[PDB]
Structure 1
Amino acid sequence: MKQVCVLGNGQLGRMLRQAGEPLGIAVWPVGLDAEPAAVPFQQSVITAEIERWPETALTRQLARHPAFVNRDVFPIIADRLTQKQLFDKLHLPTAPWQLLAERSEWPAVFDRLGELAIVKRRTGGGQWRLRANETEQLPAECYGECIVEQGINFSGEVSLVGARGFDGSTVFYPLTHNLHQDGILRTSVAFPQANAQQQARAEEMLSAIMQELGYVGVMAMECFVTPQGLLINELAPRVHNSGHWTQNGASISQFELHLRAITDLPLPQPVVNNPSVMINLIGSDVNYDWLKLPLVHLHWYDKEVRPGRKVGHLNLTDSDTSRLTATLEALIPLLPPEYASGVIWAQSKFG
């Protein structure tokens, strides 16, 4: 049978466990502080809902564990330097970049990357956007530990969520449009038919990366839409926030898909017929008033509400798009004010 242990105790692991239950797959999400005992590791397929972790009592036991799918891929992707090098190695479009080694480097960096430099920690996410006058602000700790790239002026951001099976087969969801405010995802919208050139471009780059890594399971590739096409921003070797809409807007969710892949169950293409919109709930308390609107699917994480914390998400799907945007309209006043703009941005794509 289907026994799965998930390294990491956050909402992604919870949604995976909720997904496996009606499939008859028992999923055990475990925190890094756990005792290796309470972990049915020795008889499970092992996966993670996190990207990197230190050696802990529990994790040490996971080192070289043969049931840990993709065990060896994580670190390649967890360090932005090696992740960017992978795109370069595959000749995949990505923002121009370099290791930011020393303050010495700034003028050339500016010369070459343009006016705005996006500095990102190599591991553990962690970002600064700087102009030549502002460089002092970057902590001295970053030198040697961050990459820096051209700030991309994209028209929008989209991510491709898909999965690759042990046999190399691949399946994908339509691209999803995502809006980030203060570096965090606030809203996502997916249409059953995306721009065909874009979709094709994304599936070919993601297939190429998954094949290269020998990856099995769900992976998300976030990209920037530019006049020249998509540029790859970053990868997530796991189910990703942008794909949550799949819980109610696809015949197979990203959670079920990930489980199917790693346990070697059937991996047909998920069916997506209507559009969906996802609104992330961040630092807000649950408001059951939202459930007055029948299209609203509430996904509460049962985490403590704190500022800037992802506490849940709302999914809405419908073949009637007038009904859908009307609902979004009705939802606005039921949410705290900082939600409005991302809702309006979502409604705008239905035009």
Structure 2
Amino acid sequence: MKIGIIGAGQLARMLSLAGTPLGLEFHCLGKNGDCAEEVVKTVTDIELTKVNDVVAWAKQFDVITFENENISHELIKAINHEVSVYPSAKAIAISQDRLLEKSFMQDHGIATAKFVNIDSLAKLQSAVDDHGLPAILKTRRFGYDGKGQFVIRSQEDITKAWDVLKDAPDGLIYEAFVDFDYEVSQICTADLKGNIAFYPLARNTHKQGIIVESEAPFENVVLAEKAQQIAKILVKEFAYVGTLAIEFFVKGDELIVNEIAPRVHNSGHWSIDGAVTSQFENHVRAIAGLILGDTTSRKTVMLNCIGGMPATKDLAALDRVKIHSYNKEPRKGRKVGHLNLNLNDETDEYQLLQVKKLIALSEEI
């Protein structure tokens, strides 16, 4: 069976690394030199605006998936008409737009931050009057790792935020600042029949809008049950197939949905070395019509390499650390790799302190 992936980034790279031992053949749509090229059969550079050429490319394979949900859902709708695409176009359209995303949660009694669609300066002032400060003005589409946003701390920032983002295509959205204690994420995989394989919750640490550390399992039976019930709602309403990610705010014993990602997620990279079946192999198993793998997990921490990465010779000296270099070009703010480590004894805690000092010397956010 041949699997086509829209995008040739690190997520497609690790999808192929996990799925290739299953006997599957992988092909990517992307530019030559992208980090997935050396682990996939072919890479084809086609502008996504040429819908007919993308469909003709997709029809060479048995199933299509994607690594970036910001692509046109009409393109996915056109591809899915002739070759199956997972997950669905409905999951893309709702996930790629913050307004539609939070409107969906509200329509299903799922708690999120207070949000208002922003289409004028007066609409922004009314949202600040109703739901207070601090707050954040975000673009509805595109923008990642905090880019394309303006935090409103005072009344003077209202007109400044509007001036920057007023002409952003596809609109803006107001978000009230959430009083939360910490952040967790729920990652799961749904097969063709709707069966869901759940991973334990992962507590995630952000640094300037980017995720830098993820630790699993996060033990909380109350929060885990509510997160799974939220995931079951999304899987059913989306007719979802593949790996799904939901990021939460935690305030007390109550969960607040931040955003969802209809794909394998950064907060699940721990599962490569922490679970019997990683989020990547199970996403591959899901879209290929296979039964999902067992997801029994052990305590492990993931550390992101942003901007730069410690020397492989320095990382290899900590012989328990599992190295996952993406072979990407180093650039400030860019995710170039991550590091996993099972935490069992004090030797694990010792190597964990040394690898964090290495990251601090190479990290550029």
Distance apart, 1:40 and its partner CA: 5.9
Unaligned residue ranges in structure 2 (runs of 5+): 32-44, 47-52
DSSP-derived class of the 1:336 partner: helix
DSSP-derived class of the 1:252 partner: coil
Q: How many residues align?
A: 336
- Structure 2: which amino acid aligns with 1:297? K
Distance apart, 1:185 and its partner CA: 0.8
Residues 256-267 of structure 1: pairs in structure 2 closer than 5 A: 256-267=281-292
Counterpart-to-counterpart distance in 1, 2:95 and 2:362 = 32
Counterpart-to-counterpart distance in 1, 2:117 and 2:180 = 22
- Structure 2: which amino acid aligns with 1:133? E
- Structure 2: which amino acid aligns with 1:118? I
- Structure 1: which amino acid aligns with 2:132? G
DSSP-derived class of the 2:348 partner: helix
Distance apart, 1:328 and its partner CA: 1.1
Could you say which residue in structure 2 is the equivalent of 1:67?
84
Query: 1:280/1:87 Cα in 2 relative to 1: closer, same or farther (>3 Å)?
Result: same
Distance apart, 1:115 and its partner CA: 1.1
Could you say which residue in structure 1 is the equivalent of 2:308?
284
Query: 1:149/1:61 Cα in 2 relative to 1: closer, same or farther (>3 Å)?
Result: closer
Unaligned residue ranges in structure 1 (runs of 5+): 341-351
Distance apart, 1:279 and its partner CA: 0.7
Cα RMSD (Å): 2.5
Could you say which residue in structure 2 is the equivalent of 1:250?
275
Distance apart, 1:207 and its partner CA: 0.9
- Structure 2: which amino acid aligns with 1:76? I
What TM-score, normalized by structure 2, do the two folds share?
A: 0.85
Counterpart-to-counterpart distance in 2, 1:173 and 1:157 = 16
Greater shift after overlay, 263-272 or 94-103?
Answer: 263-272
Greater shift after overlay, 10-19 or 20-29?
Answer: 20-29
- Summarize deviations over 1:22-80 as a string: whole Å, max 9, x none: 11111222217426599463332100011022599x97973633311234221222111
- Structure 2: which amino acid aligns with 1:18? L
- Structure 2: which amino acid aligns with 1:326? Y
Counterpart-to-counterpart distance in 2, 1:294 and 1:69 = 38
Counterpart-to-counterpart distance in 2, 1:37 and 1:219 = 25
1:310 pairs, out of 320, 335, 340, with 335
- Structure 2: which amino acid aligns with 1:109? A
Counterpart-to-counterpart distance in 2, 1:285 and 1:277 = 17
Counterpart-to-counterpart distance in 1, 2:170 and 2:118 = 6
Could you say which residue in structure 2 is the equivalent of 1:275?
299
- Structure 2: which amino acid aligns with 1:62? I
2:130 is the counterpart of 1:104: no
DSSP-derived class of the 2:280 partner: helix
DSSP-derived class of the 1:153 partner: coil
Counterpart-to-counterpart distance in 2, 1:226 and 1:59 = 37
DSSP-derived class of the 2:193 partner: coil
DSSP-derived class of the 2:89 partner: coil
Counterpart-to-counterpart distance in 1, 2:356 and 2:14 = 26
Counterpart-to-counterpart distance in 2, 1:233 and 1:167 = 27
